[PDB]
Amino acid sequence: GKSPDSPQWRQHQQDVRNLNQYQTRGAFAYISDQQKVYARFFWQQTGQDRYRLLLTNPLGSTELELNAQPGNVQLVDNKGQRYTADDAEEMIGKLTGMPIPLNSLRQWILGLPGDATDYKLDDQYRLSEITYSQNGKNWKVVYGGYDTKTQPAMPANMELTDGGQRIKLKMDNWIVK
């Protein structure tokens, strides 16, 4: 599609990186061979290192909440018990049994490529596809629409595939500033 060597792609990244707070909510799906999980999620990020993730099952009951600031990383589970750790990704993986690429996702959910070099853009000069390998995990990210009600526009539908496992994200809407 469009070339990464384009002023509009740089402008889009700039606008996204210039935001100080991001907020979205929607549906989440983790599908592997061992389990198929569904949930609604609330995501809030302030800056590049402070964020909050809230998950509720399809029945409406909250399942867990992850809060993170540099150094302090907290998670509250179904039983309302609070666990602390120093790494959000590791903790999520360990406490839920799912290898969610949280670090990479914090960039990708925003329409940014993170540390990924292999990626493509659509005709609107926005990320459409990413290919990233890290620690034996070759994730294939595919964007399926953006929500242009905000400027800059933010991802509406995302697909992540790591061989046998697949992550699906559906954003209802965004609030940014």
UniProtKB/Swiss-Prot annotation:
Protein keywords = Cell outer membrane, Chaperone, Lipoprotein, Membrane, Palmitate, Protein transport, Signal, Transport
Record flagged with keyword Cell inner membrane: no
Q: What is its main location?
A: membrane
The terms describing its cellular component in GO are: cell outer membrane; outer membrane-bounded periplasmic space
Question: How does it sit in the bilayer?
Answer: Lipid-anchor
InterPro entries from the entry? LolA/LolB/LppX, OM_lipoprot_LolB
Tell me the domain of life.
Bacteria
Record CDD domains: LolB
Q: Which GO terms describe its biological process?
A: lipoprotein localization to outer membrane; lipoprotein metabolic process; protein transport
| Quaternary structure and interacting proteins, as annotated | Monomer.
Q: Which family does it belong to?
A: Belongs to the LolB family.
Q: What does this protein do?
A: Plays a critical role in the incorporation of lipoproteins in the outer membrane after they are released by the LolA protein. Essential for E.coli viability.
Q: NCBIfam families attached here?
A: lolB (TIGR00548)
Can you say what this protein is called?
A: Outer-membrane lipoprotein LolB
Q: Which organism is it from?
A: Escherichia coli (strain K12)
Give the gene symbol.
Answer: lolB
